[PDB]
Amino acid sequence: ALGSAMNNLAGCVVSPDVNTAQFTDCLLGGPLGGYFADSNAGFTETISNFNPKDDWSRVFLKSDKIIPTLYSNLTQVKLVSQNTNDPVPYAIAQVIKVAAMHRVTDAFGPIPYSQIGANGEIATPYDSQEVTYNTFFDELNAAIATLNENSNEQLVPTADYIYKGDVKKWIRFANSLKLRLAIRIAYANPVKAQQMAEEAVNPANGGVIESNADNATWNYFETSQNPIYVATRYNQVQTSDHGGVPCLTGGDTHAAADIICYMNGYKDNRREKFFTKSEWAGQDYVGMRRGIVIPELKTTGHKYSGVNIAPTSPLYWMNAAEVAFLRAEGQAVFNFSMGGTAESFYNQGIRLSFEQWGADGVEDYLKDDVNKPTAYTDPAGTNTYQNALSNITIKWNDSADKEEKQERIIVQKWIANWQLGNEAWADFRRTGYPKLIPVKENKSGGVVDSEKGARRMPYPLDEFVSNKANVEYAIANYLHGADNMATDVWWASKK
């Protein structure tokens, strides 16, 4: 029972169910984080163009594959810990719980949390986002304390397809997630942010992820196939329809223009690891723009670079590079005591990412104080954006002001977090970085800003049917703005 439940919990971060992951990570996170571009011309209502149907935007709260599955399996792990007088299984499950649920509040703002039912029923009162985040810290802190007290114990190997029962790795992931969430709240509650960040990296509490061997990843989907691979490939042009040579760029989702403009300008050797080659004459990497009139796949859409992912690829939750860049930002931008210099952490993050992806050339990359992001010259000539996306160069400049340091950190963190679109979206909303290509075909009817982009998802329509009083209370008291995509969540308070 324990092992089945734990692998079911793991599937509540990025779902193994293709169409669920398609909505949460391929159509929501990827485009809103500047990584992926919607690429089916029949998608006339999308998240990325700011006119989504409810069935696209609601998924984090309404899919039975997310909250009901999470809570039903959490209850089964709690049962094991109760029955056995052993708090370690439930501590690990709580880390997974926070990994799953922070994505949900980060999408909507206020959500049901403290009063969610044992089977994941959300027809309950909502918590403010501030209360939800404080609860995440309490939950992680309890789990971290339990695991440190039992740091010599181990789960059976099949009870954990993330870390094979190694409690010391779970401690590092829990502190890393705590650090992620602490930096998330660095503008909205700087006092709490500093305390949580500094605790997370204090060696007395067990450490953070410092090596790629300790990255938080999941591969045992129970379906045989990575769901992002499948979702991005849907509708790929067929070989006998592509002149007799298979198409390799995917179907419904392509690589975004934004990240490719940065990486082309930086001559970045991770490009071949991240992207398929484009079919545009003379151009190895060209992304499709986000927030456009989407072209027909068979004519031009299939020529843009795709996502380079395999059916057997793992799903990422958090990597070591991110932890390094969190510490760089904590030190450089917020003056937190992160255990080292910002320069040291920035360079470590770049080195971790190049190592992770097996890319050569990191030493020249680290020293590059010349090359800049490109503009976006659309080879189709329809959706060009003529300005360079930024002038920020790679090499660390310890003399720079805090705004430039933040930009530089976030750009490299963003590149290293390729495929973690929900995380990129959170960082973009919090910081304004990286500087992206504005939306061109803004279908929001004047509501959403083409530069600031989507700030949240609107609440599910069904909440007004099955949970009216509680969702309306949340809107009136906790949301601090209209229930639409333009209203910022609580932590997005940078001036």
Contacting residues toward Mg ion, per CB under 5 A: 247, 302
Choice between 302 and 429, CB closer to Mg ion: 302
Breaks in the chain (C–N > 2.5 Å) following residue:
none
Closest to Mg ion by CB, 97 vs 302, is 302
Binding residues for Mg(2+): 242, 247, 279, 302
Residues sharing a CB contact under 8 Å with residue 10, sequence separation 6 or more, in sequence order: 96, 161, 162, 218, 220
Measured torsion, CA atoms of residues 473, 475, 478, 481, in degrees rounded to the nearest 10: -150
| Cα 114 to Cα 110, 205, 324, distances in angstroms | 12, 26, 32
Residues in the chain: 495
Q: Which is nearer to Mg ion, 103 or 254 (CB)?
A: 254
Identify the CA nearest to 33 among candidates 441, 302, 307: 307
Question: Residue of minimal CB distance from Mg ion?
Answer: 247
Least Å from the CB of residue 231 to Mg ion: 18
Rounded to a whole number of angstroms, the minimum distance from the CB of residue 248 to Mg ion is: 7
What b/e string do you get for 347-363 counting C-beta neighbours within 10 Å, with b at 16 or more? bbbbbbbbebbebeebe
**Least CB distance to Mg ion at residue 176 (A):** 39
Alpha-helix residue ranges (DSSP H) falling in 109-156: 129-149
Smallest distance from the beta carbon of 306 to Mg ion, in angstroms? 9
Nearer to Mg ion, 207 or 287 (CB): 287
Of the two residues 214 and 279, which places its CB atom closer to Mg ion in the complex? 279
Minimum CB–partner distance for residue 227 and Mg ion (Å): 22
- Residue 74 CA to residue 280 CA, distance in Å, equals 49
Position 70, amino acid: L
Shortest Å distance, C-beta 249 to Mg ion: 5
User: Annotated binding residues for Zn(2+), as ranges?
Assistant: 242, 247, 279, 302
Q: Point out the annotated binding site.
A: 242, 247, 279, 302
Q: What are phi and psi of 254, to 5 degrees?
A: -120, 170
End-to-end CA distance of the chain: 49
Q: Which is nearer to Mg ion, 240 or 399 (CB)?
A: 240
